[PDB]
């Protein structure tokens, strides 16, 4: 009962040319594609790339593979994949993509009586995701995934998503786990690109990313906020304690200087100011301004002591108010 299957496979491969697409010179080969994202790998902001592991499935019609037998389907493995024609699908934005080979090349091939072919493959794509880090860390990113035929233009091979967008792309519940991003959702679309080699239909999948704040709050904002509060303590010390207040201003100013350097070490070396940079810059101004207030106060503490005391007393109220007011504007401006 098993020899029958062997004959069917031999018959289909008899006189079959894998170098020619099905329907050549007769029609346009239509390929239906569906994707299942097993795991949405890490998003490297420094390299502007993200890693994704998917089960890429392609379906098409091949009349040369029609057969008759007791079983309506022929489950198979990677062995027969090379013997038949498969689309030369490639990822336009994929910088480096490699397949999984252990324990066996993770490929499946299924053939029906009518000649319909299902060919799914497991891939780990490392694509490029350009980002505009102007609102960082309150930034949203849209990482795309573009793929299509490499050699067959739109007039020969056409890719279309199967069913609706929701069914076309599926993300596992545990797969969408990132340390500094929320996977809000996914969208799909199609487009035609005109090239010197001809028109090619492009299948694009966009992943919406919402950066999750809380790591930078514990890493950058809080040390900056507490450092500013530390500087304001100097206003509560006597003017004659010149050395004591000097330590506050000098240490706080340098503390903010190193925080700015440390903060940008993890951030990509982008040549523009981000939202976090402005927050640090303002905090640096507050600590620096406090030192200037002491220097000005200590400069006139002898000629006009009366005004020096008033400035020091007033600074105890103005500085906390302005810093608190700035945060409300800053957080409300970006958290909206």
């Amino acid at each position: 009962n098993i020899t029958i299957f062997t004959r069917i496979l031999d018959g289909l491969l008899d006189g079959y040319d894998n170098r020619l697409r099905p329907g050549l010179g007769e029609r346009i080969t239509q390929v239906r594609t569906d994707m299942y994202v097993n795991s949405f790998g890490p998003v490297s902001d420094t390299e502007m790339e993200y890693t994704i592991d998917i089960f890429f499935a392609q379906t098409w019609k091949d009349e040369r593979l029609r057969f008759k037998g007791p079983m309506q389907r022929l489950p198979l493995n990677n062995l027969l994949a090379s013997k038949i024609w498969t689309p030369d699908t490639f990822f336009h934005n994929g910088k480096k993509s490699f397949a999984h080979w252990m324990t066996t090349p993770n490929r499946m091939l299924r053939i029906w009586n009518d000649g319909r072919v299902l060919y799914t493959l497991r891939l780990t794509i490392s694509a490029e995701c350009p980002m505009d880090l102007e609102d960082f860390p309150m930034d949203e990113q849209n990482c795309p995934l573009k793929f299509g035929s490499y050699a067959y233009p739109n007039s020969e091979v056409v890719y279309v998503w199967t069913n609706g967008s929701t069914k076309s792309v599926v993300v596992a519940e545990d797969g969408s786990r990132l340390n500094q991003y929320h996977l809000m959702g996914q969208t799909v679309g199609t487009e035609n690109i005109s090239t010197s080699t001809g028109e090619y239909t492009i299948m694009t999948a966009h992943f919406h990313l919402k950066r999750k704040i809380g790591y930078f709050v514990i890493q950058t904002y809080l040390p900056c906020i507490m450092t500013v509060i530390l500087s304001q303590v100097s206003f509560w010390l006597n003017r004659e304690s010149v050395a004591a207040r000097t330590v506050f201003g000098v240490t706080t100013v340098l503390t903010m200087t190193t925080l700015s350097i440390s903060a940008r070490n993890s951030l990509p070396k982008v040549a523009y100011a981000t939202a976090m940079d402005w927050f640090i810059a303002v905090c640096y101004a507050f600590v620096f301004s406090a030192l200037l207030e002491f220097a000005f106060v200590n400069y006139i503490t002898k000629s006009q002591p009366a005004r020096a005391a008033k400035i020091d007393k007033m600074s105890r109220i103005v500085f906390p108010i302005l810093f608190g007011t700035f945060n409300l504007v800053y957080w409300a401006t970006y958290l909206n």
Copy 2:
């Protein structure tokens, strides 16, 4: 006496199709799997992955390989593995798995008279282990290992553990050696997952990990604890020594600030607070509060000196007590 073995191998391969599973169209192929963990590689918390080296063994029945001869078994090597049918087993959560090829592809194939086939393979699997670092470093992790057929659904190929759970998975005594984890034990199970390509039986092995503390005690807790004690020394200095006590508060506050930054550099950039973060935050409050006490004491040291001395004297007792009390609650809360 050696030519007989050659004839047997030629006969079995004569008319044998490796593209068809044994028992096709007649029964369901049953595969018995056993695992031996040679070494439980490092667990990368930053990348949420772990590396494991195993001797993956699969056993199944193939009537096409039945033979008669003086020897009841036919030990072999990787040469004949490709000539026969083998299950397309793959690791669902395996991000990157590679085989060992030196000196020779580490594969063994054994065939008995009845047709039973033993096919073991050495692998180095780099799987993903999601972790909830809310109780870090007093956290327990359960890293799984899922594998199954890629192309053959549950109706064609079924995986079952051999004998009990203990015999199914074995870990070498020297293999289970990690720098920051204890391998408490292992558990195995089976489940069926419904997919668009059909139902597939999933074989899962869970490794229980108990993070071992002591590195963070020497790295984070002790510097934080001693820094807090250092700040409390300021309470034993005279109020008029404004500069001396200012150095204590400023240096200690900044010392805790850098410790928080340094501590999280090794920790994954998770957007939530861990148990260690709370300990650092409380320690930061103690050192910061001590500086505020001096500022308040130095602010009223002239108008009401009597109360200033009492506060300074009282702080010498309250601060050590509260810090010690906090540790007992903190350690008892998590070490239980």
Copy 3:
């Protein structure tokens, strides 16, 4: 209607030797090359290399592939590429180049009736780009890309750009995105190099890079500029406050020392001074000079107090003026 294509391919490969170039012993094989830069990868200054992803296309004439049929063109894939002769093009300056294999080897082959052959390939070239970092960060770089035949000298195979320079090399709008460089434009050229193995025509493409400033302003210049301003605040403090002014000078001098070390950590370990180094050196002189002024002032504050006050008062004006004057000369000198 599909069997006709199979016969044509069989006929062309019948009696075809892929080890012999077309026109051997009769003429010189002319290859027309065009390039499309999908993405201009990162430029590693430390390793003096850059990564580029391109669609490398080669066109040549092969009379052995002439055919007659209803279709004037024969779109194909990588399968037939190995069966025919292709140029042994290689990148002379390419340190490490790898092809893309997923989902299918990204190669296309097209053949016309006259025998013209189009063979395009996707590549990721990691070439070496020597740089003279004397005006860093106000430096312009010209990273080349040289390629040609490895085995066929100029007398056998010749490479020529197709159409003009603009059409020969094309860069995608989104591809030319670098964190610290502007892709001003591209230029192409040809040359002959004499070697022991014969003369070889070299096709060269030069990419003009204009480093974008703004990251170093936020990372190096601003901390240095503010540190210098911080030191000058000491001039506004009383001479008798010896400890207070000592903290300013010591902290600022050490702050500049660490900034110089930190700044060069990212910069390649070049054994010469850059423009940024001179800026840091001058800033170090200003902060160091301020401390010397205090030491000199504090040294004569008793013998001749009158001159000490004048020097301190005068320094409040001279130092800000010189530092501001230096910046105008420095920025104007390099920003021109």
Copy 4:
């Protein structure tokens, strides 16, 4: 005179099955193994692995390769290695081993008239070397190297070292060069391991490593030793100089805190205390104790000045003596 060699090779391969070991069903195949360590690569303490490059040679007897000819030996290359049977030797503890392929696969095959076969191979083995870092840096390590057959149990293939232990394993004079280890010597042995797949003879080579001190002396011990001496200088300052002595204690205590953090960055994250950790801990106690002495002295400098001076004077002698005494015990305890 060269055609004779061609006939001999053809005759031996005629009717030769490479899937069957020599002497199958007649005797036990004996393999003689010798090793030459070209270079003992770096030992990664963090990853508990070491890299070694060797010339692995295996010798065995194969009666199927007997031949008669003018030349008693048949030097060859990797071409014939795949055509005959070779042992499936593998490294049990080898985490990742790769062969050398340039310029040609570095394999040699030699055959004698009697059928003796010599098959040597060049390998770069990255094995795992567990270490107990309790006496670090005064620790000795014994990195093993285990290898044997993967598919042939002890009843079919047996490995034995050739000649004595000294000749069996040889290390090049320049190969044994490590930055932080001394290669004292090598030892070899054999053992049988019982496994579910049968008994396998294991050939083990142990490399004795003696960590060389001097890098940690310049990196950790000396800064710690000088820091302690720096703290003791405070005892020679007047009590009334409260700020001056406070700077000594605060700076020294924090200096030791960062040294402990910095020292363990290179060290593996082991969850136990090493010898260096105890040395740092004691040094931290000395600097911390000195600050406590000043605080206690400054606390009673008014009520009982007489005792305060005596304590300060006495501390100038006790502290240097105890620190010196501790070092003699510490160094003698571990350097013995």
Copy 5:
């Protein structure tokens, strides 16, 4: 006119055994080798290795390839390389060598009428270069490059440089570009090594490297030199300013401590003192000695004030002189 070439290639391969070296059993195969260094890659001091990209050319005589035809030479590509015999040349000290495969395997094969064969190959060799860093950074290194036959002893295959040493090895003008080394020149030689597998002729090429100073001057020496000068400023302050002079000594001593740690981070972890270490150690003594002078001066400032002033005044002259004198001896000793 092209079919003639096809017949010649078929005739040569007819009855040709690639497993036998030319002249086997009749003479000794002589191989002439020439090298062209396209680029001398980076020299990794930490890993004691260097990377080099070369065009490795080998020439030998093979009477089996003699042919008669209109063309005196047969330019070819990698296709025919595997069909004929080529030497099994390998690099003895090569830790990891890989070939270039894009766009086509960069191999050339040329055959003349007499049977002379030219076979050149492009390689990227990562060899090991042991270094004695005793005079670092004033150290000279001699990185070798050893290669020879793997399977054919000196009695079968012999390697000889072609023409003189200068022509045998050539380095491109732009190839010899290193960030911290000068390529003074190259030398070549030959030697015979006796091994258990027989005598093998070794072809060695030595590259003379002269480390270029200037990065460490800007990174290590200058901060150390200026730090020492900073400490000497304390001698110009009044003795009663105890806190002011304490800050100078404490900050400078700790500044030198961190510089020593930072400097050795890039340097390999060698267990011996380098020239830079001695310079840092002396600088540490000067800053430390200055603090001791203040402590001694402040200790006797009351009992014998007259001597205290003289010591402080004298130290202003002695310390600068000794430090300047040391540099002249240090620089002259190593820069000679």
